[PDB]
Amino acid sequence: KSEVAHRFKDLGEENFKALVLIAFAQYLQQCPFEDHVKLVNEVTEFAKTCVADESAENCDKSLHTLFGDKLCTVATLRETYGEMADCCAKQEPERNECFLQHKDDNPNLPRLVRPEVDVMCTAFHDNEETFLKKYLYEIARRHPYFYAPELLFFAKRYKAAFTECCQAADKAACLLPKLDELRDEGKASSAKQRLKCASLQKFGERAFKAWAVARLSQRFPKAEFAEVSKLVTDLTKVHTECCHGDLLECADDRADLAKYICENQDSISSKLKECCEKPLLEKSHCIAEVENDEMPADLPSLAADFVESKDVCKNYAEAKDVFLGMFLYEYARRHPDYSVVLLLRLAKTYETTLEKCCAAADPHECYAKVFDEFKPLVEEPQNLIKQNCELFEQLGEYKFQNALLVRYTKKVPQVSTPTLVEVSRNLGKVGSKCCKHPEAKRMPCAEDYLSVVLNQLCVLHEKTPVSDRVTKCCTESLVNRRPCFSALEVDETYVPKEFNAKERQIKKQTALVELVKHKPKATKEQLKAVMD
Amino acid sequence: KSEVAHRFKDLGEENFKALVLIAFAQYLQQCPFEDHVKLVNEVTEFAKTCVADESAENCDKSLHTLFGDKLCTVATLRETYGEMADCCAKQEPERNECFLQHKDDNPNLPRLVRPEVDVMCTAFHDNEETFLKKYLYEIARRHPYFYAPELLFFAKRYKAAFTECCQAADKAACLLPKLDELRDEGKASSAKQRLKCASLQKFGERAFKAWAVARLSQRFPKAEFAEVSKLVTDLTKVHTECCHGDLLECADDRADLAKYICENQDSISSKLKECCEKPLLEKSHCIAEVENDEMPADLPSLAADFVESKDVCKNYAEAKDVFLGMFLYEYARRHPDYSVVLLLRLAKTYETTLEKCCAAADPHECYAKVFDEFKPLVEEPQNLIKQNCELFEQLGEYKFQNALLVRYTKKVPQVSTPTLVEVSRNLGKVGSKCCKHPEAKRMPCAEDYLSVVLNQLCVLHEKTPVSDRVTKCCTESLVNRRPCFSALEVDETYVPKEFNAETFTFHADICTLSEKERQIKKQTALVELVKHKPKATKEQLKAVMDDFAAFVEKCCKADDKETCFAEEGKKLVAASQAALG
Amino acid sequence: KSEVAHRFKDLGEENFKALVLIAFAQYLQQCPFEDHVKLVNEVTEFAKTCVADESAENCDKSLHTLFGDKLCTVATLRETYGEMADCCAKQEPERNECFLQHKDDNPNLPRLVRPEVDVMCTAFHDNEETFLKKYLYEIARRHPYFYAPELLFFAKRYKAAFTECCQAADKAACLLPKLDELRDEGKASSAKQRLKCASLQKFGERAFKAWAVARLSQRFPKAEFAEVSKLVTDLTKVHTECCHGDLLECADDRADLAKYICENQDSISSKLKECCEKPLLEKSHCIAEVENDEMPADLPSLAADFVESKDVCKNYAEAKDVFLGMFLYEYARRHPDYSVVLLLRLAKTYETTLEKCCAAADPHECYAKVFDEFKPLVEEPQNLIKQNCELFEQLGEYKFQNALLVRYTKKVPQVSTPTLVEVSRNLGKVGSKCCKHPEAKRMPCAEDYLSVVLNQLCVLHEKTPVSDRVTKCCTESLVNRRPCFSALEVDETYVPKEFNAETFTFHADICTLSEKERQIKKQTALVELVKHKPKATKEQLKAVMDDFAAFVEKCCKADDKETCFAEEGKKLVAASQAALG
Ligand SMILES: CCCCC/C=C\C/C=C\CCCCCCCC(=O)O
Ligand SMILES: CCCCC/C=C\C/C=C\CCCCCCCC(=O)O
Ligand SMILES: CCCCC/C=C\C/C=C\CCCCCCCC(=O)O
Ligand SMILES: CCCCCCCCCCCCCCCC(=O)O
Ligand SMILES: CCCCCCCCCCCCCCCC(=O)O
Ligand SMILES: CCCCCCCCCCCCCCCC(=O)O
Ligand SMILES: CCCCCCCCCCCCCCCC(=O)O
Ligand SMILES: N[C@@H](Cc1c[nH]c2ccccc12)C(=O)O
Ligand SMILES: N[C@@H](Cc1c[nH]c2ccccc12)C(=O)O
Ligand SMILES: N[C@@H](Cc1c[nH]c2ccccc12)C(=O)O
Ligand SMILES: CCCCCCCC(=O)O
Ligand SMILES: CCCCCCCC(=O)O
Ligand SMILES: CCCCCCCC(=O)O
Ligand SMILES: CCCCCCCC(=O)O
Ligand SMILES: CCCCCCCC(=O)O
Prior knowledge:
- Chain A is mainly α.
- The first copy, chain A, has helices spanning 3-11, 13-27, 33-52, 63-77, 94-98, 117-126, 128-142, 148-165, 171-203, 205-219, 225-243, 247-263, 280-288, 302-308, 312-318, 320-334, 340-357, 363-367, 370-394, 397-411, 417-434, 439-463, 468-476, 481-486, 504-518, 524-531.
- Chain A: GO terms for molecular function: antioxidant activity; copper ion binding; DNA binding; enterobactin binding; exogenous protein binding; fatty acid binding; identical protein binding; protein-folding chaperone binding.
- Chain A: Zn(2+) binds at residues 64, 244, 246.
């Protein structure tokens, strides 16, 4: 059996080559485009050889061994990758896993300078395939964890925008608002997948699956528990593969999962028919973003089975995570108006209550009160979004950003300035995108997006660690990252800074961070005035 | 014991505040928004005071007394309410009941102005709380009998439309269709509640309960008669409270009733599962419009117990309204295809038959043929709906409305023109609403909606009566209102109105109006025309309607718009005056 | 008693005129628009006479006689229909039937020119009535079997598109997408109706009815068999009327059937509620395409009554087609994931099994293995669709079409070139329409559509037969036409066509054509290429196609358009003619 031949045939030549390009650009982010183009062609010709004759040389090797061997030939001979070549002394599995630390979440790369639209349209028509490879290359090397099947989807949307607008009357009026929209969606997609990987790889399979159970139970509340569980198992496989760089198997398995879902809408959701009529890449993307289904008509009494019953400890002790998973499933399918991190916070609270109360005498009188525990947990984010969005409906995004900017620079000023500017702007952006949504979607939007942004901070900071408290909030609890950051207090240990004499806001937001780093003990009134 | 604190606790702070806003908006319809806001906050703080110490001052007075006192202070001080302050000389219970005549079913209020969609969306985002308070306020003062818990539901749907649409690409394409459907729903809900109050308050508890029995037996035909009767009794308490202004008790009791129904759904209907998993406002609303359950499969013969048996009279004399209630329950649970007013008509026919035949020597030989009486009573509404729906399908709604305008202006030309236009437009909306259904659902939709619309006519007319025939059809019989109006013929004792030139003068404001707005203006003119020349034939009127239709199509595409309407309009007036003079 | 009067009153004047226009346009396809307008107005004036007085001259004649007389006046007098005058010597019923062969499935008519969108919007405003008649006329003459009630539906959607888009800022951006979607739906509707007529008229009542049982049982699987059969009976009456030209009765009966279905939806399907709330034309259309209901949850085992029972033969022998119809009904209601032609193939296999096994000593041992015969029958279309859809998803519609062109030109090269291009393009559109569905809906869509498109081939070929194998596949078995055509291997006995130079000389007007126009010109040449050298392989043919694409790219991006084509045309044909012989 030739694994490379198997995946080439499943995926077809064009998806194969693009996925292979993404795989090398995300691991070898400093190599030039033309180097990766030749590499892709070599791999693709090797693959076709293996389709013709699976016994041909190296065709029976694992994609894991083959990808690493290719990587190691580059990094061994070249000098730009001296650190990564240290992995190449290892055997599998240590060698593949050693590659992960060399994925650079903030690569030091020049900003893409943009030709004129008519120029780009000309280049687009002149060689469409080369135009799109260069798109895949520039994005992938800048977002080394970008979800690979979704990047294929983005490339498709990118091309369709050039197809449409390069025939426009005002080509720029058509193209530029599309590319800006496309760029915004992609940054969010990248940051979301980065948290999927971090949750699975750093916090473990159980955490990733609990999160998947909650979100899928919200999205498909009519689905039976066994069906939700099956979907969570497949997704775990897909994202383990993608997050460890096995992009061919990931894309291939994601295709199979989309097909399984579309062949079984009658057991999953009434909202899928239009998704399941689109071609593969759009189909998977649509399914990932489909609106919540309506609730079934036969929901059980949650308090009957999990709080008021007297044999809860006996059912829990027979199968602890199954029982907790049923609780999470029943709770999330009933509350599409909750954030996922809140449901998980609630499920964990329920879990601690059972561990505690089932040891005591008369556990039922102990655990019957767990719903009361939930009340302040539900209110604290409700109060936080309400507060901060009210400041947001007052102060515009730019202003709201400077608010958070000042707030977080006070909390952790040991953090490097560009990290603080970057995270604070994204924090502000959550206000922009979530505050005006329907209340049945406010908390899901606002708090789950904050988790995405804080993961960016945790990932940037784990590379160059500068704040013990950040390390603490980042690593102590996945679901409690947001409250841990909210509850951080003003730093008492950082020394002020000496005096140093519409792209403009970032230089402005730079100095405001450098101002708070200069006079840390001030409050907002003085900080507003110095920039005025 | 503090009622205000009790209702505050059952309802929650924001349901309390919204219901108090509704209650004062419906009784003091002319006071501006900002006065009511300051009045609601005062009540709310009073309520919390009573939540703390139920022995605090006034905290032990009944909500009935507190509302009247608060009303009367406002009415004795602020002017614009010197008639309502006459009520304030009276003690309870006369004081509260006296307020009812000052509920204005047609208040003279400025038309709601509409900013741009994106502008409305911005106002909605800037202060979503005040946005919705103004909504409650503007609706309640225009619909002083709007069912208060349903108004809270509409406010949620209204908030949902803005949250769903104010981030759309094309906000207006999203928001305007929803708001117009909501407006349709709201008007119908208002008019239905108005009939619930009028039937209970004007015709009596027994009339209200009988209607309730018929409708709930259709909807819950597997329910035991005793279960139907319990629901009918709780609904009577709920609507007595709402219709007399006790909106806090009304809302609290409606919530308890939805609770009871959901906890007892396996004794009531299988269609309730979805409703009973919903939040409270959605829950109650869902229950009120749930589809009819299926009939039992093991029913006896209705005729055996009520017609064929020879001792009907013995069972009737033991308990007359109970026996009539059982007949009505049996007939209605079997006939979801009958309008409620028809079923009530049949129960009344049966009652009259028993009262007459039970006095006879051989009663069974007198009442056994009662089904023969029923047959013409079923066929007349069947025929009426069939023929009018065929007309509606030929004309579309706007022209069906115009056919009804002429018909009703001829029947009762003494009625005011805006009331004639209002009522006739709604009668045509019955066509749009009900004719689309197959014949099984057609009659319940069409005849009960007709009844709802004729009640609107009766309420506006009772205030300013101008026609004896209208007063007669309105008051002689609740359930026979529709046939009585259906059988009114042309008034031949009507003096045609004298010509008024400005009445038939049109201006380019026509072209600058939305469809609805231009329609009403043409319809207003069409009623005035018929009033000026009542003996004008259908084809004479179609002739003037063609001339005008061309007239406005030409003068809206006219180089100079206003001068066209003036120039060609006088040629139309003269041409029509001569064609009908 | 006057048939023309009865249908006039049932249909109303507007439906009646439109249907008469369609009837004459479909039988007299070469007569100009204004002739038909005059003819319809005279027929319409006669019908109104008959409504007013059913004894008036000619009012008691049959529609057949009246229609055929009017037809025969034009044909025997106006030298345009010389052949059609032959029918006119006959009497009814032979005269009316004789007309059918002169229905031209591919009339020789210039393509419709399209004015500018704003010009069309103007014409539509100025005389909507004439605009719509011209639409009905041009479609009906080009599609002489278009289902007449559905063409009324399409005209209403056509009007709504103009009503909406002609008040749009960018009229063309709104309207051209809608017109393109209506055209694609319309072409599919026409081809579907042509198979309904061909299956009924050529293959008989029993074949049409069995197909109808299968499709309605899939769609209405809760309905009782008696209810399915009633629907099938009525549908047989409807389509017999439409397919033989009796459009007034067909439309009248179809509306009665839609009414019957909507009055009895609780005996038929839970999915009909929304369809049954629409106006008549939308209602009938909606019902025709409503989604399949859910199967009952209390079905018995089909195998028990039809396979495992040991006295199948006794029950079959008592009532053979009823027993086979029950089988089909049971199998089809359980298998919405099977095409109708597969279900019919399975029923025919079951029928052959009973005929063979019921003569055996132990019939049960013989027919109890019938499910083993079904397995390869199910597998082959599943396999064929899976593979072809993968090819489609790797090529897209245009390339898929071109691949099918090569395959089918090799299969039946005697078939004319415009026919091969028409049929191959439509076969590729089956990929676009059906391959996007999950596999549970893929087979019904793809294989029944494949059958629709092959009937197009069969219908054009029956007129001008050039291939015995096409005639064999078209006439051997209705339900097996698709496997028969799928299994056709390359014609190894075809004599290649000579070389014609200007068949392969392309000119500058290529770049001046729309997307569909260039493809068809390119595809016409690709067929002629395969006819020139039927031995070449797809890679050899892709090569000649490859540089040809470049040839049109550069020569259209050229200073003098025509010059590059003429110059580089010689070299292209030269190297291609060298590359292949
Ligand atoms: C908008 C909320 C932020 C996104 C959440 C990201 C990470 C959560 C971690 C676990 C994900 C595992 C299941 C993947 C489900 C895909 C749906 C989605 O795309 O969610
Ligand atoms: C289309 C139906 C017409 C509505 C009838 C309106 C008024 C009915 C009069 C008396 C009803 C009193 C009982 C209340 C039942 C509520 C059901 C409903 O919501 O009706
Ligand atoms: C996509 C499948 C198309 C197949 C239809 C074509 C031919 C069918 C032959 C038999 C006609 C009898 C059924 C008539 C009603 C079916 C409605 C429909 O089917 O519209
Ligand atoms: C402008 C080039 C094309 C971008 C438009 C589609 C981009 C899809 C992927 C989004 C990521 C964009 C890269 C941003 C660089 C960065 O944030 O570091
Ligand atoms: C400013 C425009 C927004 C208001 C839209 C109305 C919301 C629908 C609520 C329905 C209740 C009854 C409305 C009828 C009003 C009237 O007749 O004056
Ligand atoms: C782009 C041309 C639009 C013509 C009018 C659109 C309405 C579609 C009517 C569908 C009937 C079948 C149309 C196909 C006509 C043909 O094949 O020549
Ligand atoms: C009385 C005749 C049969 C009663 C109703 C049956 C409906 C259609 C009849 C045709 C029978 C076709 C069933 C088998 C299909 C086949 O073998 O072709
Ligand atoms: N995390 C922020 C709160 C916040 C920032 N941006 C937001 C956007 C929406 C809601 C809340 C927020 C804090 O520490 O308080
Ligand atoms: N009440 C009307 C009939 C009518 C008006 N609107 C309707 C809607 C549907 C059915 C009947 C009607 C009359 O008797 O003149
Ligand atoms: N009839 C074709 C198969 C085919 C053509 N178009 C299709 C679309 C979908 C599925 C199959 C097909 C063949 O056997 O050669
Ligand atoms: C899918 C297995 C996960 C168990 C869910 C428990 C929630 C948790 O406490 O994190
Ligand atoms: C020489 C073959 C290299 C295969 C690259 C596969 C990339 C991956 O999915 O890990
Ligand atoms: C519950 C009391 C209602 C009485 C029903 C009898 C109907 C009638 O004759 O009016
Ligand atoms: C000052 C207190 C007024 C009480 C308001 C209660 C409203 C009502 O339900 O009648
Ligand atoms: C002059 C008589 C013409 C009758 C038209 C009937 C059309 C059709 O055949 O249904």
